[PDB]
Amino acid sequence: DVSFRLSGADPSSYGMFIKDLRNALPHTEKVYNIPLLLPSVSGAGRYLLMHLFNYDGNTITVAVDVTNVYIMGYLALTTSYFHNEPAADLASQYVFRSARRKITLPYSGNYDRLQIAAGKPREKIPIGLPALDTAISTLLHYDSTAAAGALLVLIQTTAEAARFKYIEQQIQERAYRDEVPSSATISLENSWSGLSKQIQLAQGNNGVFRTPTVLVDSKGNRVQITNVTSNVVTSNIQLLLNTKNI
Numbered sequence: 719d720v721s722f723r724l725s726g727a728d729p730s731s732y733g734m735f736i737k738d739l740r741n742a743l744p745h746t747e748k749v750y751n752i753p754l755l756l757p758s759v760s761g762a763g764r765y766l767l768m769h770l771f772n773y774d775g776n777t778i779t780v781a782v783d784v785t786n787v788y789i790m791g792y793l794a795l796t797t798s799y800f801h802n803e804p805a806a807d808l809a810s811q812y813v814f815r816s817a818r819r820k821i822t823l824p825y826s827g828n829y830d831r832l833q834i835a836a837g838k839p840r841e842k843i844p845i846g847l848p849a850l851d852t853a854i855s856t857l858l859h860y861d862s863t864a865a866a867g868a869l870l871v872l873i874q875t876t877a878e879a880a881r882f883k884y885i886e887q888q889i890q891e892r893a894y895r896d897e898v899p900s901s902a903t904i905s906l907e908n909s910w911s912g913l914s915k916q917i918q919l920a921q922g923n924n925g926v927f928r929t930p931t932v933l934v935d936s937k938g939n940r941v942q943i944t945n946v947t948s949n950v951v952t953s954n955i956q957l958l959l960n961t962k963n964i
């Protein structure tokens with residue numbers, strides 16, 4: 719398990735949580751010196767439990783699938799919640815079995831459904847440590863519309879940050895003031911799968927991408943990532959989605 723307390727949290731204790739979250743995800747191989755996540759994991763070992771604690775010390779346990787960093791559900795008090803999709807339904811067989819009741823949310827977990835349910839594209843939803851403390855708080859009591867927005871916050875803070883050092887740094891900058899994500903944050907979120915595959919394909923292709931990945935940069939404009947010498951590859955991405963899952 720890993721853990722994070724919003725109470726007293728600063729850029730460094732968050733950095734330390736995001737480190738632990740990365741280091742909880744098993745791998746047997748590194749590709750260009752980036753942990754390569756497993757094809758699959760059987761049984762309960764598939765699921766990492768994150769204990770998040772709001773500013774007041776109230777808590778939720780989030781279940782994360784260690785092959786893709788995908789959040790499947792969480793436990794609030796004696797109620798478990800899960801996204802409405804086959805992979806979360808599977809997870810429900812392994813985690814939080816002692817919850818008094820299980821609610822299945824009325825959406826799946828992908829950004830497009832969550833945004834629909836939230837009424838907002840995540841370009842318009844502030845994130846940061848304060849947004850994360852709100853989200854923990856929201857998810858403590860079932861409200862499906864408000865949960866969708868909180869889950870957007872939760873996914874980007876925790877999973878998207880473990881995936882990209884850049885997104886981790888963005889959150890750190892938003893330690894005490896939330897702010898909507900940069901376009902490059904959005905770009906990086908939406909290319910994880912694409913990058914993970916091109917980095918794996920570069921391995922028999924002299925570091926060169928079979929297909930270039932188009933991002934948006936820090937500056938605020940469009941760029942093509944064509945090989946493993948890119949900053950995106952050499953310092954930004956921290957985890958690879960195995961091509962066996964793409």
Ligand SMILES: *[C@@H]1O[C@H](CO)[C@@H](O[C@@H]2O[C@H](CO)[C@@H](O)[C@H](O)[C@H]2NC(C)=O)[C@H](O)[C@H]1NC(C)=O
Binds near residue numbers: 944945948
């Ligand atoms: C790999 O990526 C680098 C960019 O990081 C490419 O080189 C650049 O592209 C052209 C020259 O061919 C110039 O516009 C840039 O200034 C170059 N930058 C640097 C730092 O060299 C390179 O062409 C790519 N290689 C492959 C095989 O795709």
Ligand SMILES: Nc1ncnc2[nH]cnc12
Binds near residue numbers: 788790829873877878
């Ligand atoms: N549920 C989820 N968990 C992690 N990353 C995601 N990206 C979109 N949805 C996600």
